[PDB]
């Protein structure tokens, strides 16, 4: 399959670590956050893009598309890099460069 020409979007819920580990178990690590399993799925070519949530009205980067079901199943949790766990590294890198 080929990628769509035009930018896509999907709404999807954040999952608790507990509920995410009911599928992925110990593959879920401390700088990961799960979302989806809700009828949509990130897939090939989405990696590195955003998972945003509103914070005080402003879209805020909560996840980075990372990995998931190897057939992009819409019934399993998608896994994203957890930006709150990595943002101190982000700010330090910016400050030094």
């Amino acid at each position: 399959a080929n990628t769509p020409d035009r930018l896509q979007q999907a709404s999807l819920p954040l999952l608790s670590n507990t509920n995410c580990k009911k599928y992925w178990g110990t593959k879920i690590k401390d700088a990961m956050i799960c979302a989806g399993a809700s009828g949509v799925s990130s897939c090939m070519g989405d990696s590195g893009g955003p998972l945003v949530c509103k914070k005080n009205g402003a879209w805020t980067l909560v996840g980075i598309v990372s990995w998931g079901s190897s057939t992009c199943s819409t019934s399993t949790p998608g896994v994203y890099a957890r930006v709150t766990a990595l943002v101190n590294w982000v700010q330090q890198t910016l400050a030094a460069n």
């Binding site: 990130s42 090939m44 989405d46 990696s47 990372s66």
Partner: protein, 58 residues
């Protein structure tokens, strides 16, 4: 040649769309495929030349 040369290409679980080469034993040469960016198997090369030097003739 190494038996890993006979494994089908493996996209893996990450969500990237990265062009890689795998040896296709049915055709006798390396072909392109889309790799997810993590957990590559060994039949996964960055160029056709690396692929054929490693698996050519398997």
């Amino acid at each position: 040649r190494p038996d890993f040369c006979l494994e089908p290409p493996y996209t893996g679980p990450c969500x990237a769309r990265i062009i890689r080469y795998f040896y296709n034993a049915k055709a006798g040469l390396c072909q392109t495929f889309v790799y997810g960016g993590c957990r590559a198997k060994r039949n996964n090369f960055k160029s056709a030349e690396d692929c054929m030097r490693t698996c050519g003739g398997a």
